[PDB]
Design a protein around this ligand. Structure first.
Ligand SMILES: [Mg+2]
Ligand SMILES: [Mg+2]
Ligand SMILES: [Mg+2]
Ligand SMILES: [Mg+2]
Ligand SMILES: [Mg+2]
Ligand SMILES: [Mg+2]
Ligand SMILES: [Mg+2]
Ligand SMILES: [Mg+2]
Ligand SMILES: [Mg+2]
Ligand SMILES: [Mg+2]
Ligand SMILES: [Mg+2]
Ligand SMILES: [Mg+2]
Ligand SMILES: [Mg+2]
Ligand SMILES: [Mg+2]
Ligand SMILES: [Mg+2]
Ligand SMILES: [Mg+2]
Ligand SMILES: [Mg+2]
Ligand SMILES: [Mg+2]
Ligand SMILES: [Mg+2]
Ligand SMILES: [Mg+2]
Ligand SMILES: [Mg+2]
Ligand SMILES: [Mg+2]
Ligand SMILES: [Mg+2]
Ligand SMILES: [Mg+2]
Ligand SMILES: [Mg+2]
Ligand SMILES: [Mg+2]
Ligand SMILES: [Mg+2]
Ligand SMILES: [Mg+2]
Ligand SMILES: [Mg+2]
Ligand SMILES: [Mg+2]
Ligand SMILES: [Mg+2]
Ligand SMILES: [Mg+2]
Ligand SMILES: [Mg+2]
Ligand SMILES: [Mg+2]
Ligand SMILES: [Mg+2]
Ligand SMILES: [Mg+2]
Ligand SMILES: [Mg+2]
Ligand SMILES: [Mg+2]
Ligand SMILES: [Mg+2]
Ligand SMILES: [Mg+2]
Ligand SMILES: [Mg+2]
Ligand SMILES: [Mg+2]
Ligand SMILES: [Mg+2]
Ligand SMILES: [Mg+2]
Ligand SMILES: [Mg+2]
Ligand SMILES: [Mg+2]
Ligand SMILES: [Mg+2]
Ligand SMILES: [Mg+2]
Ligand SMILES: [Mg+2]
Ligand SMILES: [Mg+2]
Ligand SMILES: [Mg+2]
Ligand SMILES: [Mg+2]
Ligand SMILES: [Mg+2]
Ligand SMILES: [Mg+2]
Ligand SMILES: [Mg+2]
Ligand SMILES: [Mg+2]
Ligand SMILES: [Mg+2]
Ligand SMILES: [Mg+2]
Ligand SMILES: [Mg+2]
Ligand SMILES: [Mg+2]
Ligand SMILES: [Mg+2]
Ligand SMILES: [Mg+2]
Ligand SMILES: [Mg+2]
Ligand SMILES: [Mg+2]
Ligand SMILES: [Mg+2]
Ligand SMILES: [Mg+2]
Ligand SMILES: [Mg+2]
Ligand SMILES: [Mg+2]
Ligand SMILES: [Mg+2]
Ligand SMILES: [Mg+2]
Ligand SMILES: [Mg+2]
Ligand SMILES: [Mg+2]
Ligand SMILES: [Mg+2]
Ligand SMILES: [Mg+2]
Ligand SMILES: [Mg+2]
Ligand SMILES: [Mg+2]
Ligand SMILES: [Mg+2]
Ligand SMILES: [Mg+2]
Ligand SMILES: [Mg+2]
Ligand SMILES: [Mg+2]
Ligand SMILES: [Mg+2]
Ligand SMILES: [Mg+2]
Ligand SMILES: [Mg+2]
Ligand SMILES: [Mg+2]
Ligand SMILES: [Mg+2]
Ligand SMILES: [Mg+2]
Ligand SMILES: [Mg+2]
Ligand SMILES: [Mg+2]
Ligand SMILES: [Mg+2]
Ligand SMILES: [Mg+2]
Ligand SMILES: [Mg+2]
Ligand SMILES: [Mg+2]
Ligand SMILES: [Mg+2]
Ligand SMILES: [Mg+2]
Ligand SMILES: [Mg+2]
Ligand SMILES: [Mg+2]
Ligand SMILES: [Mg+2]
Ligand SMILES: [Mg+2]
Ligand SMILES: [Mg+2]
Ligand SMILES: [Mg+2]
Ligand SMILES: [Mg+2]
Ligand SMILES: [Mg+2]
Ligand SMILES: [Mg+2]
Ligand SMILES: [Mg+2]
Ligand SMILES: [Mg+2]
Ligand SMILES: [Mg+2]
Ligand SMILES: [Mg+2]
Ligand SMILES: [Mg+2]
Ligand SMILES: [Zn+2]
Lengths: 113, 59, 46, 104
RNA sequence: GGUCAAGAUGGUAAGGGCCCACGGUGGAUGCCUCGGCACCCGAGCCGAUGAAGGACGUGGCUACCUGCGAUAAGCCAGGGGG
RNA sequence: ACCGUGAGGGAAAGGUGAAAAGAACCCCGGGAGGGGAGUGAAAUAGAGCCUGAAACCGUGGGCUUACAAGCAGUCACGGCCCCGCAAGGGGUUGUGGCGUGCCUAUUGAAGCAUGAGCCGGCGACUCACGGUCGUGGGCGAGCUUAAGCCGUUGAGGCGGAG
RNA sequence: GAGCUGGGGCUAGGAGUGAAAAGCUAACCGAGCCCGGAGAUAGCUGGUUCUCCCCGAAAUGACUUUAGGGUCAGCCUCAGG
RNA sequence: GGGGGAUGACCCCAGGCGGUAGGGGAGCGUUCCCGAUGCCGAUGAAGGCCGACCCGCGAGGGCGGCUGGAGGUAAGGGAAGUGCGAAUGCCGGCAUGAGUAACGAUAAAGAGGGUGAGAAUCCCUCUCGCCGUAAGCCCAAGGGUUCCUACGCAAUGGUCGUCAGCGUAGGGUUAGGCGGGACCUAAGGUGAAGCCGAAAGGCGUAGCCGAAGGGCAGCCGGUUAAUAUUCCGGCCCUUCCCG
RNA sequence: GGACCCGGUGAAAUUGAACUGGCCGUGAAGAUGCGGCCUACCCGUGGCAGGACGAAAAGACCCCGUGGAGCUUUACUGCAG
């Protein structure tokens, strides 16, 4: 049995946030909790929020037992891009993309036999 | 200056090769001498900090 | 530095305004045109 | 919007889930070409905690049905289409089943 | 068993390739249409009795469209219709 | 809309479902979002809604790679993984042999000559009336109607001026 | 001071204005911009999209305001003899 | 090509078969029509995704499985907006460069406390710095709700935001004297009369229109979250009408 | 003050695809890509600018076009005057 939370349309760049997701993958939820608080990146916040919403979803929904949990799977996909004009010298005008992330934490019960 | 430019779009292989150093490393962490939780060393705990002086108060 | 648009409300109505247009055969046709196209504004505003 | 059946009428449901079941047309919606024949084609709507039934989660109401889905009953059996007799002075509906008035 | 000189082969992936699976992104493709297009009929002027086209208004609550004009999402009468 | 002082220029953008039955209520959360519950024939039909291709990005798995050097393939054998009763096949690639991108323009281009970041859509030998050959048929010292006229579930026929 | 400047005005496309640079005339003026003639014309450059089968050239002559374009001839092809 | 005489498709035999410009010949596929009031179809149309399978020289056609949910359309013929890889093509989408340059004046910051889910960035205090013929204040253009206040942070803000010139909603602009008009004329403009011009239209004395100029009567203070020579207080004045 | 490091935000020209070394040769005559030989473990960061005939701009010079425009005159032909 396994539980999952997915944040969608998070306004952040995937490359940036995908980096801290790497940081906690296959970790017991208790270390994963520890790391993200003391990891210095903006995307630590957002990921911890998903981790949690998936911890809750474990015990409260799928009958999981919190102290047995670790991170089975996790990843961030790329939602649609916010495109804004950025005006430039000699009247040029580029377009910057404010990118968007779909964050996914998947939880599992450590074998705990 | 004549404004240099990349000559060939760089390949997936080569950019991801570029990135092979870019992985983060987890924060180095020690158990706090009193409280249940974890703290990074040579620091005062977010919660109930120290002994020899007045710590920031979660006490 | 001093640019080309120097808005002055008197000049605008006196130049592209409805009564300007109706004086000159040329101008009258700009109205006839703008109407036949179905423009929402036959003439600029001020 | 020519229709056929009206509010008073007694109609049969000719097709679908509720096929077979006579009831009375509760209301008639010419804009949608739909009749509401309760009790028939009931459904579960969820609802919030605002006033009456604050505590109440759900409410069973009944859906409209496409007007073509039903037929007037004809106080003999299961049919007809209908016809129109003028006579004197004017106006009508007449069961062609046959042959009856159409009452209320 | 294990000291010891030569030979010799194996796992290892920071990262990367190809294959497979499952997704994200994106909106091609098929189907749908009450919009368009062509021909053929039909029909063909309006205006100082203030036209065409507008402005500003007009709803118990009303941003916009539609309608309508201070009688303002409408007033009177005839025909229709149920 | 937007762009232009103005005349003027001038886009994008359609689809849940048979029916809103458009997801009460609970859980994480500041909201967003998700997870149960529920609805539904179906919910990767959940409103950033039919189908949902490709470039592109990501997770997981198999094979491989840190003393080799290259238009990236190809021919051979061998290793490892998969499928199969077998002989057999699919994947991957260690070594060995061979190997100068596509198109365009040129006497001649891998060319250090043009074009192209990649993918998906759109994108260029037509039509009328004459002509001139050929071909399939009708009639043949003849052949053939035009306008129009009658007639017609998309029915034809008449008409000999030329 | 042949000064600078606000407000109101007039002059324009072979036309204006110019203490004259062919300057300026709404951010490119040896002839403004817009819409139209209009799909002007382009002996030039580029591009021209499925598959299989047979044959298979020329880059020479003559004339050409012709020379990187044509017309006739030559060389390819297909049908009948 | 020559036999076999099926009158050719079938069978032997024998030869030819590199190819650009280009000529010839066979086919494949796409959209539509007849075939069709038919046939296939929810026991699943078109389209999609796989196949190591079958047929075809090839373009293709089959078949099987998954997806998909309402269309499809034989044999045989007809008609064309019929096949893309290139045009610095057109339209869209998404990459590379790259977590790179940059984040817009070198006037300059620091701490405490508050608020809040969250604070370098919001509020208050103290300290420090900068402008001061301004980088302060008042008017005209021009802009047009940006004003004041309550709630708010998706986006806009080059970071952040609890803040805002941003979203929602409510409120706010008070004049006989200030500015303009029921006054004047200026350049110009328009124009009875008049004149000229194929048409359109061009001119023109009077008049009329036209202003930051001429003419004309309000000064000081208080008040609101937001207006004040406009409301209020006090002190003054103008023009019309009628006695 | 930048540049460098960390946290936040995050462009651009360019880009056939790349698994993109040196020499002596060869080749459309100036080779990362062909031959022979030499050299070379995989991947980055800060730096220099010699090469990719580096980017940009369908060379402005030059010639071609029976292309265009401005200008001249005792070129031709007209028109105003
Ligand atoms: Mg700049
Ligand atoms: Mg600018
Ligand atoms: Mg310089
Ligand atoms: Mg100045
Ligand atoms: Mg402008
Ligand atoms: Mg003014
Ligand atoms: Mg309108
Ligand atoms: Mg009937
Ligand atoms: Mg790794
Ligand atoms: Mg999607
Ligand atoms: Mg009207
Ligand atoms: Mg209205
Ligand atoms: Mg009536
Ligand atoms: Mg009546
Ligand atoms: Mg009646
Ligand atoms: Mg405008
Ligand atoms: Mg929710
Ligand atoms: Mg169910
Ligand atoms: Mg779900
Ligand atoms: Mg699906
Ligand atoms: Mg679906
Ligand atoms: Mg989408
Ligand atoms: Mg549907
Ligand atoms: Mg979908
Ligand atoms: Mg995809
Ligand atoms: Mg992988
Ligand atoms: Mg060695
Ligand atoms: Mg090795
Ligand atoms: Mg290498
Ligand atoms: Mg090899
Ligand atoms: Mg080319
Ligand atoms: Mg060339
Ligand atoms: Mg050449
Ligand atoms: Mg040459
Ligand atoms: Mg090249
Ligand atoms: Mg090259
Ligand atoms: Mg070159
Ligand atoms: Mg060239
Ligand atoms: Mg394409
Ligand atoms: Mg086409
Ligand atoms: Mg012909
Ligand atoms: Mg013929
Ligand atoms: Mg014949
Ligand atoms: Mg005859
Ligand atoms: Mg002046
Ligand atoms: Mg002026
Ligand atoms: Mg001119
Ligand atoms: Mg001067
Ligand atoms: Mg302009
Ligand atoms: Mg200029
Ligand atoms: Mg000229
Ligand atoms: Mg052209
Ligand atoms: Mg012409
Ligand atoms: Mg010419
Ligand atoms: Mg042309
Ligand atoms: Mg040959
Ligand atoms: Mg020649
Ligand atoms: Mg030529
Ligand atoms: Mg010839
Ligand atoms: Mg043979
Ligand atoms: Mg051949
Ligand atoms: Mg059947
Ligand atoms: Mg079809
Ligand atoms: Mg299904
Ligand atoms: Mg299918
Ligand atoms: Mg075409
Ligand atoms: Mg091509
Ligand atoms: Mg270019
Ligand atoms: Mg593009
Ligand atoms: Mg880009
Ligand atoms: Mg990048
Ligand atoms: Mg940084
Ligand atoms: Mg760099
Ligand atoms: Mg740097
Ligand atoms: Mg920097
Ligand atoms: Mg700054
Ligand atoms: Mg607090
Ligand atoms: Mg001073
Ligand atoms: Mg103003
Ligand atoms: Mg503005
Ligand atoms: Mg404010
Ligand atoms: Mg507030
Ligand atoms: Mg915000
Ligand atoms: Mg922001
Ligand atoms: Mg506001
Ligand atoms: Mg006046
Ligand atoms: Mg005049
Ligand atoms: Mg005058
Ligand atoms: Mg006057
Ligand atoms: Mg005045
Ligand atoms: Mg005055
Ligand atoms: Mg006054
Ligand atoms: Mg005062
Ligand atoms: Mg104020
Ligand atoms: Mg005021
Ligand atoms: Mg007073
Ligand atoms: Mg060399
Ligand atoms: Mg090679
Ligand atoms: Mg070779
Ligand atoms: Mg070499
Ligand atoms: Mg470097
Ligand atoms: Mg260099
Ligand atoms: Mg440099
Ligand atoms: Mg150089
Ligand atoms: Mg150039
Ligand atoms: Mg050139
Ligand atoms: Mg020059
Ligand atoms: Mg010439
Ligand atoms: Zn009956």
């Amino acid at each position: 049995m396994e539980a999952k939370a997915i944040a969608r349309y998070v306004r952040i760049s995937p490359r940036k946030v995908r980096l801290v997701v790497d940081l906690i993958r296959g970790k017991s939820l208790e270390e994963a909790r520890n790391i993200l608080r003391y990891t210095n990146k903006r995307g630590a916040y957002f990921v911890a929020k998903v981790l949690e919403s998936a911890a809750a979803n474990a015990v409260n929904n799928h009958d999981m037992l919190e102290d047995r949990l670790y991170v089975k799977a996790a990843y961030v996909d790329e939602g649609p891009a916010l495109k804004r004009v950025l005006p430039r010298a000699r009247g040029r005008a580029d377009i910057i993309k404010k990118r968007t992330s779909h964050i996914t934490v998947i939880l599992g019960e450590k074998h705990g036999k | 200056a004549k404004h240099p430019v990349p000559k060939k779009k760089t390949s997936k292989a080569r950019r991801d090769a570029r990135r092979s150093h870019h992985a983060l490393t987890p924060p180095t962490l020690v158990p706090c001498p009193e409280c249940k939780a974890m703290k990074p060393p040579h620091t005062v705990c977010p919660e109930c900090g120290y002994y020899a002086g007045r710590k920031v108060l979660e006490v | 530095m001093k640019r080309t648009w120097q808005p002055n409300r008197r000049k605008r109505a006196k130049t592209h305004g409805f009564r300007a247009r109706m004086r000159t055969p040329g101008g009258r046709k700009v109205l006839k045109r703008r109407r036949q196209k179905g423009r929402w504004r036959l003439t600029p505003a001020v | 919007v020519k229709m056929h059946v009206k509010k008073g009428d007694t109609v049969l449901v000719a097709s679908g889930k509720y096929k077979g079941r006579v009831g009375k047309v509760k209301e008639v919606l010419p804009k949608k070409y739909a009749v509401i024949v309760e009790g028939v084609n009931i459904v579960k709507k969820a609802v919030r905690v605002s006033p009456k039934y604050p505590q109440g989660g759900f409410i069973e109401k009944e859906a409209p049905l496409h007007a073509s889905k039903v037929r007037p009953i004809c106080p003999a059996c299961g049919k007809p289409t209908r016809v129109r007799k003028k006579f004197l002075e004017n106006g009508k509906k007449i069961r062609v089943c046959a042959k009856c008035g159409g009452a209320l």
